[PDB]
Design a binder for this molecule. Structure first.
Ligand SMILES: CCC1=C(C)/C(=C/C2=NC(=C\c3[nH]c(/C=C4\NC(=O)[C@H](C)[C@H]4CC)c(C)c3CCC(=O)O)/C(CCC(=O)O)=C2C)NC1=O
Ligand SMILES: CCC1=C(C)/C(=C/C2=NC(=C\c3[nH]c(/C=C4\NC(=O)[C@H](C)[C@H]4CC)c(C)c3CCC(=O)O)/C(CCC(=O)O)=C2C)NC1=O
Ligand SMILES: CCC1=C(C)/C(=C/C2=NC(=C\c3[nH]c(/C=C4\NC(=O)[C@H](C)[C@H]4CC)c(C)c3CCC(=O)O)/C(CCC(=O)O)=C2C)NC1=O
Ligand SMILES: CCC1=C(C)/C(=C/C2=NC(=C\c3[nH]c(/C=C4\NC(=O)[C@H](C)[C@H]4CC)c(C)c3CCC(=O)O)/C(CCC(=O)O)=C2C)NC1=O
Ligand SMILES: CCC1=C(C)/C(=C/C2=NC(=C\c3[nH]c(/C=C4\NC(=O)[C@H](C)[C@H]4CC)c(C)c3CCC(=O)O)/C(CCC(=O)O)=C2C)NC1=O
Ligand SMILES: CCC1=C(C)/C(=C/C2=NC(=C\c3[nH]c(/C=C4\NC(=O)[C@H](C)[C@H]4CC)c(C)c3CCC(=O)O)/C(CCC(=O)O)=C2C)NC1=O
Ligand SMILES: CCC1=C(C)/C(=C/C2=NC(=C\c3[nH]c(/C=C4\NC(=O)[C@H](C)[C@H]4CC)c(C)c3CCC(=O)O)/C(CCC(=O)O)=C2C)NC1=O
Ligand SMILES: CCC1=C(C)/C(=C/C2=NC(=C\c3[nH]c(/C=C4\NC(=O)[C@H](C)[C@H]4CC)c(C)c3CCC(=O)O)/C(CCC(=O)O)=C2C)NC1=O
Ligand SMILES: CCC1=C(C)/C(=C/C2=NC(=C\c3[nH]c(/C=C4\NC(=O)[C@H](C)[C@H]4CC)c(C)c3CCC(=O)O)/C(CCC(=O)O)=C2C)NC1=O
Ligand SMILES: CCC1=C(C)/C(=C/C2=NC(=C\c3[nH]c(/C=C4\NC(=O)[C@H](C)[C@H]4CC)c(C)c3CCC(=O)O)/C(CCC(=O)O)=C2C)NC1=O
Lengths: 49, 161, 162, 57, 49, 160, 162, 162, 162, 160, 162, 162
């Protein structure tokens, strides 16, 4: 038996990466908003979608 | 490290003048070749391990370097050699997409030569492996893109040599 | 995190079946708003500082006691922390709008927000009012069509606090 | 006896690293006097070779 | 982990009121976490003084 | 440039450029002709745009030309014209580059202390850049004015 | 507890002011939404046992481990405990919805639940899944307008556990 | 509170499996040792007062400062509580030996005991010495095999306290 | 972590006692089984891949839902994580058998494992089934006595998870 | 070796060799003669071990020398047998050193990605080293066979 | 950092050859000297404090000016540094004697030490004299057979510093 | 970190002498000057921003090439480095003035400064002209008595640069 517990969170593993997910986490990793390149890339993604 | 755009912007900022017709023409030359560079980037990205493997087979496998007493004689040293070839291929692709050789100097040639002296790495065999990698890359990407890759590869070779 | 596409893919992958009509309808709806949402995200990215300025002005005009002695925003440090929190809320609302999902808000904002604001003594109702003020300012800045999309995620944040 | 300028090359023997790790292996750094004995011990235990050390101040 | 169960309420230490004359003072999970969960079983009997 | 950011981010994770980054460079190079056309258009408008930005700034912020203002005086106008010219050139450099890094490096990193040295108010900067943006977007097409708006609003936000 | 009207009353009491236009606007908003709240509350009261039934069935179908041997819900006792917890969640979410404030959820439900579950060994992820199941089950019953109102309180419970 | 039989029942229930040869082997081993357990338990029950008297005498002889003024066992009530605690330890060791499991020791004895003694000011090391005193006293009465059996539970109490 | 020698040393250190005849009996008993333990550990090290493969085959045959969509083995990534956990359990059972004490199993494996799996969504019962499959595989390769010894530690892991 | 690992461990804590470490080194140097016997017997019969090691490897896995296989061709099969010779020599070095650190430093660190560049199947490597272990343990007595086979099982696990 | 065993392994691996009879004889020599090497190392570990005591005393006796003001060791800091240098040198000499090879002196002692002293201005003559003072004494404690072995390593350190 | 009072202590340490009358005289001189030293420090720290203001203004009036493109000061970043270098020169001159010794200039400023400016394309002559233009304003502001001591440090900075 366990003498102690630390608790359980809600884990969020990554299955695969999407273009939108990659761009948004790229912005969030640097803790910033979007530069024109990322904006144009997202526009092109929504065009090709 | 800088692109062609970065270089021309730096030059015209040093001069202090707006981008004239000549600078715009060089920028158009860079953007027109963009699709070719991106296609070659696709090809290198998809088949990078195949290219490195072919280069190692043609340049390194049955030379005495892989024999005992040779610089590649170890599982660790052989793996490190293949890892270095991966470095060269990836950063050559970076230089092609940048259309500039500054990133090769700053990222790859900064302290590499005397590091190879200290570790005992042979320069000439490394240059031979880079040349073989250049041949394999040209064969995979066709003549037009191979011509561009050749500049970055022999830049690496001159940096080693 | 997730986005709308990842949520749809996982919904149809856990079942083991191809995209049905509802899947294509959801994907079409998400893709249709994509250019409007990208335009809104660009406008907010270029103009975050303004939105924070008028939103904070409206909040502190509606509740002066916050910026007077004894208020949680009475100090240069606490005022700066307040406007910094406003910038967090704006940026994460933009991220969620672009993602089409609220997973990033649960994962990276709401997880630990109540504990933080209760430990620091920050008024949660006044924070909800500030988020609402950013909602009106952003809606005025990016247009009504993008205003609704951004207000969805602002309302998500507001209901997460209260 | 304040600062040491140390040029050192630390190779890798435990594995092969995929990242750049070129400046991590060969580098020149300024180290304080009180720290230099420990830093030299760490470099020598890592298997690295101390190429040179000089007195700056 | 390396010690027996604490003298604690089965539903956590934040579920123990302060033993004062009046008031019903409990710890809060949000004002300051200060939370210790323990694997207290269904049959565990507390030691009372 | 966009390619510079993509290469830096690719090195950061130590792998070749992702399909998302590759498509970003695709869209960047495919839009090169339009961006160069916009930057060239910004050039023929030299004195026009500079002066409408200047007098709009004077109307919006009379304190600058009022007595006691930091820009008060005829000699200050000569520096005003070339400062607005510098910022316009940086905007064009960013337009061709596709990112605001030339603007950040040449005119934003250290501008705050620089105008503190000259005792220059940052609100004057934001109002001047907003006047420039108004004039330039008015001259340019709506689709292109939207793309130039990011650069001008970045200039305004970074100046304050 | 505290609801929206008492919330306005309390903030104006702490500030020591008579009601202004903003307070009357908030009160009018609550009065506008109240009839919809009453309809939804009556609907949920009618279909409480049903909603619990489909939500629990959906959760145990998505996560069959819980009900199978070695699962946290595997016993008559533990299954009944799960259903009791879900009934509590539904009832207090209905109280919060009808009140227009989430304070009752903080006090009666959320203040102590994480530590209780962590000590008991309950999977909090599966419990959030059960709450989401109740949300999407009750949305179809109360109607879209009432579903939007009930969703914020179900999201509040889910975020409080997470 | 689970004995060996209940432990096997639980390890087979959590798997959802029916009983097989290995479970029957374990229960047969317990049934084999049951006669030794019952004889030892009866001997300890008949001689419980003598064991407590002998062990308390040995402990207070080895540590006379306990029953002298200034010692934690100095008053009639504190001496009574000390021998009462020794009665707890003996009785629960008898229960654990008869059950064949140490669950009752984590379950009814050692849970929160350190905190209780630390609040009361009771010496922990001296209590462990008294538990040993009971162990050596009980081994002689119960014989070699029953002493080897009861020693694991007495050492369990000692290690849990120490 | 501790082995049998360290366990005896601790149980005599807390009591402030030198080794008596029983302590030397336990130490001699452990030293008697040392060569058998080393042989079993070497054999299991030689055959670890075979054991993991065939045990995973048995588990996924008896639990087909794990590898189907919605199961917690349904991808190559998720399957690979499962087989890595299987390698964990076999390695730590070998460590515990070589030490002769279950302290490493509680310290480095069992502590926090249920909470981690609850957070991830891993089914604990299927993990126990995989561990029992490990036991069945390992017994044949290690022989009778080594199978009894290693089955003790597999049972300890199963009961810790169960 | 055992001495080298003990010295490294002591140097890690900046201390002298512990009584346990002195004891382990004493046990290593005491039985060094038997390790020399084992290494000499393995070295003397190297060509046999290699030849029939290739024999069971190729009969157990005909696909390797089948067309399309990694070992097809006289040169490639010769390199196969030379790799087996390398690993037998490494095993003898490990026998002499008293531990597997020569195997680590020569032929284990980076073996996977090296044989990835070589297309070499690692199950084939495992089967080859298992055949080598069977033969070598067969030539040696059981008391020797156990410790000799431990090194081979180590190598097989490394390749697997 | 290589011993004699690893030294012959490397010198034979670099040429790609198997061990020869001469290699086996050279291994036999080290295996024979191992016991006396271990005994010498044990005595040195025993008396290391004493050899440091006497080495510092003798060094500061034959050269007076170091401890006195203006001396290379004139400070408690520099005194501790010098005695620490003797301690490290002696420990590494013991390491080299156990390993039977001087590679460890190159790879952890002479690695950057010589130019460190050159930049610091440490007198090489005084260091060398300290090394003779250390070895002439340590030889007496370790015995003549071990004295001649320690001599080569101490002389190697001297020649490296020289 | 060299100071005149600390310099005296260091000299008497390295020579191993006690306090002498000359040391007391120079310490008295330092302590007597210290009050005006602090007054000069306070006056400069009052006006260091302004001193930099006019120093940079005079530098860019006399050598205007630096401001327009093709000058080393044509960038917001390079302008920042330009004014920061002047601020550093003034601040370290004040630090030396309070310290009463020029050794801090050699330690923290001058060493490697020639090489750094020549490597980075920095013009030495314009830097020295700026140091002179800052000399004049500092000397005018502090007054002749403070200016005599303050200008020496500026001369030594220039001489090291020249
Ligand atoms: C104790 C730390 C502290 C400070 C310092 C502080 C300053 C402060 N000044 C404010 C407004 C203001 N402050 C000023 C003063 C400016 N007008 C001129 O430009 C001058 C350059 C300058 C004064 C010399 C003015 C004019 C406003 C009104 C602007 C508005 O309506 O937002 C406000 C907004 C709320 C309010 O007006 O009460 C704050 C919080 N708050 C703090 O908690
Ligand atoms: C993206 C996830 C995230 C969030 C949400 C976040 C909020 C956050 N706000 C904080 C401080 C603060 N936050 C505020 C917020 C203001 N108080 C006023 O009353 C307003 C009602 C309100 C905003 C409109 C204030 C005043 C402080 C200072 C509190 C203090 O230092 O005592 C802190 C403590 C650390 C610090 O002081 O910088 C955090 C963590 N941080 C994060 O990383
Ligand atoms: C991105 C820029 C970059 C480069 C260029 C780079 C090269 C590089 N190769 C290294 C090792 C090595 N590199 C090689 C490969 C060489 N020897 C073979 O014969 C070939 C002729 C030749 C390669 C074609 C070998 C064998 C080693 C192992 C050295 C040793 O262990 O002694 C090392 C030492 C660090 C380590 O082992 O991980 C570096 C820094 N590293 C970098 O971060
Ligand atoms: C016999 C030992 C004992 C004491 C003394 C005690 C104090 C106590 N005071 C309370 C409320 C309170 N106590 C005070 C009094 C304070 N606030 C004012 O500002 C003054 C500065 C100050 C009094 C001089 C107030 C205002 C409250 C109401 C706060 C609330 O209930 O929210 C409460 C909350 C429960 C209740 O109101 O029934 C307790 C427990 N509890 C005990 O078991
Ligand atoms: C390309 C990057 C770059 C920029 C942007 C730059 C600006 C700059 N403007 C300066 C002067 C100045 N610039 C201004 C003008 C501004 N101040 C007022 O507040 C107005 C609101 C505003 C006009 C719109 C003023 C007032 C001065 C001080 C005296 C003068 O007019 O020259 C100076 C000091 C040297 C000089 O007189 O030329 C610099 C470095 N320099 C650069 O290398
Ligand atoms: C070990 C103790 C234990 C028991 C007994 C237990 C009962 C139990 N019965 C269930 C459903 C069920 N049980 C029955 C049985 C009924 N069919 C007829 O009506 C009869 C009156 C009656 C049986 C004689 C049926 C038909 C269902 C399916 C109900 C549904 O799918 O909605 C389920 C849900 C299974 C799932 O969600 O995957 C459980 C857990 N659970 C436990 O942990
Ligand atoms: C899309 C990404 C993806 C795929 C395809 C995938 C396949 C996959 N097939 C499996 C079983 C299996 N797969 C196959 C064979 C099939 N495999 C196919 O590539 C052939 C067309 C075909 C035979 C010609 C067989 C026979 C098994 C049974 C177990 C075993 O092979 O040992 C397993 C192991 C789990 C289990 O035993 O059920 C995986 C992970 N996993 C993935 O994450
Ligand atoms: C001592 C450390 C060390 C090792 C282990 C090592 C292995 C090694 N084997 C090689 C060739 C090879 N090795 C093999 C053998 C493998 N393929 C077969 O399928 C079998 C499964 C298996 C042998 C049992 C083959 C077929 C080749 C030819 C591959 C080629 O030329 O592309 C090569 C390429 C260079 C050369 O042949 O000279 C290396 C580096 N090198 C080292 O320095
Ligand atoms: C493990 C291998 C190794 C050693 C032992 C080593 C010693 C060493 N001695 C040092 C200073 C010193 N070293 C000495 C000792 C010298 N002066 C006199 O006493 C003697 C002639 C002589 C003794 C051999 C002294 C006195 C100092 C401090 C004096 C100073 O500041 O220059 C330093 C500079 C950094 C520091 O002291 O923290 C090192 C690294 N470095 C190494 O990599
Ligand atoms: C510890 C004390 C200290 C000193 C002494 C110091 C000098 C110093 N000045 C530097 C750069 C610089 N220094 C200047 C200033 C010069 N160029 C201008 O035209 C003027 C003629 C002149 C100033 C009056 C400039 C413009 C740079 C930027 C060079 C570059 O772009 O790298 C740098 C390199 C840092 C950098 O490039 O950002 C140093 C170290 N730094 C220090 O931390």
């Amino acid at each position: 038996p366990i003498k102690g517990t630390s608790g359980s969170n809600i884990a969020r593993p990554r299955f695969y990466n999407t273009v939108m997910v990659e761009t948004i986490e790229g912005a969030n990793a640097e803790e910033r908003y979007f530069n024109p390149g990322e904006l144009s890339s997202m526009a092109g993604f929504f065009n090709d979608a | 490290m800088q692109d062609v755009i970065g270089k021309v912007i730096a030059e015209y900022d040093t001069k202090g003048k707006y981008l004239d017709a000549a600078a715009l023409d060089l920028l158009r030359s860079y953007f027109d070749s963009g699709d070719l560079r991106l296609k070659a980037a696709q090809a290198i990205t998809a088949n990078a391990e195949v290219i490195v493997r072919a280069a190692s087979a043609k340049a390194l496998h049955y030379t005495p370097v892989t024999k005992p007493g040779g610089n590649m004689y170890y599982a660790r040293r052989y793996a490190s050699c293949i890892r270095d070839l991966d470095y060269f291929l990836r950063y050559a692709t970076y230089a092609m997409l940048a259309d500039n050789t500054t990133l090769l100097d700053e990222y790859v040639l900064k302290g590499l030569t005397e590091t190879y002296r200290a570790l005992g790495v042979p320069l000439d065999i490394s240059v031979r492996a880079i040349n073989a990698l250049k041949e394999v890359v040209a064969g995979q990407v066709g003549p037009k893109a191979g011509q561009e890759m050749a500049k970055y590869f022999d830049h690496l070779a001159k940096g080693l040599g | 995190m997730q986005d709308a596409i990842t949520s749809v893919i996982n919904t149809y992958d856990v079942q083991g079946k191809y995209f049905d009509t509802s899947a294509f309808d959801k994907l079409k709806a998400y893709y249709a708003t994509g250019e409007l949402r990208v335009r809104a995200a660009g406008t907010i990215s270029a103009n975050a500082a303004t939105i924070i300025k008028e939103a904070s002005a409206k909040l502190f005009s509606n509740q002066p006691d916050l910026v007077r002695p004894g208020g949680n925003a009475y100090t240069t440090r606490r005022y700066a922390a307040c406007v910094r929190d406003m910038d967090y809320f704006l940026r994460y609302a933009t991220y969620a709008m672009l993602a089409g999902d609220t997973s990033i808000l649960d994962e990276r904002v709401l997880n630990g927000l109540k504990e933080t604001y209760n430990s620091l003594g920050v008024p949660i109702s006044s924070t909800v009012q500030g988020i609402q003020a950013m909602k009106e300012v952003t809606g005025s800045l990016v247009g009504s069509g993008a205003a609704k999309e951004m207000g969805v995620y602002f309302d998500y944040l507001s209901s997460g606090l209260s | 006896t304040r600062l040491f300028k140390v040029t050192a090359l630390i190779p890798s023997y435990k594995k092969v690293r995929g990242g750049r790790e070129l400046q991590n292996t060969y580098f020149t750094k300024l180290v304080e006097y009180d720290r230099w004995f420990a830093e030299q011990q760490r470099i020598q235990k890592q298997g690295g070779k101390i190429l040179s050390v000089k007195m700056v101040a | 982990y390396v010690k027996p169960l604490p003298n604690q309420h089965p539903y956590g230490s934040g579920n123990d009121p302060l033993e004062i004359q009046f008031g019903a003072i409990f710890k809060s999970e949000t004002k300051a976490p200060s939370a210790r969960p323990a694997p207290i079983g269904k049959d565990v009997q507390r030691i009372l003084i | 440039s966009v390619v510079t950011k993509a290469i830096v981010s690719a090195d950061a994770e130590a792998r070749y450029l992702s399909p998302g980054e590759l498509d970003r460079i695709r869209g960047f190079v495919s839009s090169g002709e339009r961006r160069l056309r916009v930057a060239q258009t910004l050039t023929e408008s030299r004195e026009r745009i500079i002066k409408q930005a200047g007098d709009q700034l004077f109307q919006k912020r009379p304190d600058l030309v009022s007595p006691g203002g930091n820009a008060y005086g005829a000699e200050r106008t000569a520096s005003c014209l070339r400062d607005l010219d510098y910022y316009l050139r940086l905007v064009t450099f960013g337009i061709v580059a596709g990112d605001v890094t030339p603007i950040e490096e040449i005119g934003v990193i250290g501008v705050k202390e620089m105008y503190r040295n000259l005792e220059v108010p940052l609100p004057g900067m934001v109002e001047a850049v907003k006047a420039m943006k108004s004039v330039a977007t008015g001259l340019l097409s709506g689709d292109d004015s939207a793309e130039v708006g990011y650069y001008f609003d970045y200039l305004a936000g970074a100046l304050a």
